[PDB]
Structure 1
Amino acid sequence: SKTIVLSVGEATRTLTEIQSTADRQIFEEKVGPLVGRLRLTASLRQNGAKTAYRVNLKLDQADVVDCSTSVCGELPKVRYTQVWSHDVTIVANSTEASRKSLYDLTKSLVATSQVEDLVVNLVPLGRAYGGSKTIVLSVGEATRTLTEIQSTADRQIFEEKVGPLVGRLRLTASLRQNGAKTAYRVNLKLDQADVVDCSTSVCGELPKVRYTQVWSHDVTIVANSTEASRKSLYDLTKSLVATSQVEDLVVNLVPLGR
């Protein structure tokens, strides 16, 4: 049918489509047992007065185990599930260079070594290399350095420092553990506001923001995980954003599946 190919190096994991509703669009891998497989619940909406879209991905990953060899008479069974959701907000009258920049920053956010250690080894964000706690988001040769402005007990807010003060980049990380200390909750969020000024056109006009576009994340990690269970969940989501189909889902609003 319609497939997405997630290259995790030389191993390619092909998800095939099992559902096509008007908005929801469920993919699933077909290799292995039937009880625990990959899942990709894509979506698209336009809520309100037709002015803002809402992309919504959700990459589940179940850790199935089958030990009928050891104990006689059992079947394969799912231990836990670890998800990595996305919540993109795109306003309808945007510039295509603003939708491309929001994709290129989040593709480089996931591909850095500070978000990798945040979901694998639970290390918080920011490494001080001669100065403040900074994150570097390379968009090729252009590097956009975000310095930390606030670190309370829950939140950890990063922000770029160049340009005007009214519209700047953001990175609101946090980390929780809800329930009986059994599952964590990583929560990244990158705000990009588009600022414009026309003081060469209209006198007395200071810069102001016209719209904002977000890209949230919501990672769920159970506490007694395997390390290669969290490492493979990161490597699939890093390879999901790097595809050419999630690029067109954000830039041109084309649904997934080729």
Structure 2
Amino acid sequence: SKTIVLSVGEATRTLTEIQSTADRQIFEEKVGPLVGRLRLTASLRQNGAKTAYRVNLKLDQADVVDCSTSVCGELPKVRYTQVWSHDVTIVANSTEASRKSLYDLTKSLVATSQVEDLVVNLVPLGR
């Protein structure tokens, strides 16, 4: 039905709206078993009255492992869970541009080798 798609260069992972309030929606990758299935959480509220709007975004990548193959009966389980949440705060009367700027930056900001190098190998930022 209602979905979202991402490309890992060549690969392609697809998310499906599983539950949904207009308030906060939730997506999952219905593929692997039931557990671990990669999840993403959306959100949205209004701080004070009309002051501003706050958007929240969680992302839960659980690392799963099946071994009923090598260990008698033991089932698939969750080793750990990694996350990446975003808390964006936007002003009510912003400039259509003022907002884009923000996006565009964060957009390229992330793509930065520096960033990933940080995240994956814990390499302090700046060069």
Indicate whether the TM-score tops 0.5: yes
Shift of 1:157: 0.5
Q: Distance in 2 between matches of 1:191 and 1:228?
A: 31
* 1:212 positional shift: 0.1
Higher relative contact order (CA 8 A, sep 6+): 1
Q: Per-residue CA shift, 1:194-231, capped at 9, x if unaligned?
A: 00011221111210001000000000110100011000
CA shift for structure 1 position 248: 1.1
Post-superposition Cα deviations, 1:46-71, rounded to whole Å, max 9, x if no partner, equal xxxxxxxxxxxxxxxxxxxxxxxxxx
Give the Cα–Cα distance (whole angstroms) in 2 for the partners of residues 203 and 166 of structure 1.
20
| Whole-angstrom CA distance in 2 between matches of 1:198 and 1:206 | 6
| Contact 1:188–1:216 (Cα < 8 Å) also in 2 | yes
Matched positions, count: 127
**TM-score, length of structure 1 as denominator length:** 0.48
Could you tell me how far 1:137 is from its partner in structure 2?
1.0
Task: Specify the alignment match of 2:104 in structure 1.
Answer: 235
Q: Which has the larger radius of gyration?
A: 1
> Structure 1 runs of 4+ off > 6 angstroms?
none
Structure 1: segments with no counterpart, 5+ residues: 1-131
1:182 touches 1:224 (CA, 8 Å); kept in 2? Answer: no
Any conservation in 2 of the 1:174–1:188 contact (CA below 8 Å)? yes
Instruction: Give the Cα–Cα distance (whole angstroms) in 1 for the partners of residues 69 and 42 of structure 2.
Output: 38
Q: How far apart are residue 241 of structure 1 and its match?
A: 0.5
In structure 2, what is the equivalent of residue 172 of structure 1? 41
| CA–CA separation in structure 1 for the residues paired with 2:20 and 2:69 | 39
How far 1:155 moved relative to its partner?
A: 1.4
RMSD of aligned alpha carbons: 0.9
Q: Alignment partner of 2:44: what SS?
A: strand
Report how far residue 186 of structure 1 moved: 0.9
1:139 counterpart (8, 11, 15):
8
1:86-121 superposed Cα distances (whole Å, 9 cap, x missing partner)? xxxxxxxxxxxxxxxxxxxxxxxxxxxxxxxxxxxx
State the shift of 1:237 in Å: 0.1
Deviation at 1:180, TM superposition (A): 1.9
TM-score by length of structure 2 reads 0.96
Q: Which secondary structure does the structure 2 equivalent of 1:193 belong to?
A: strand
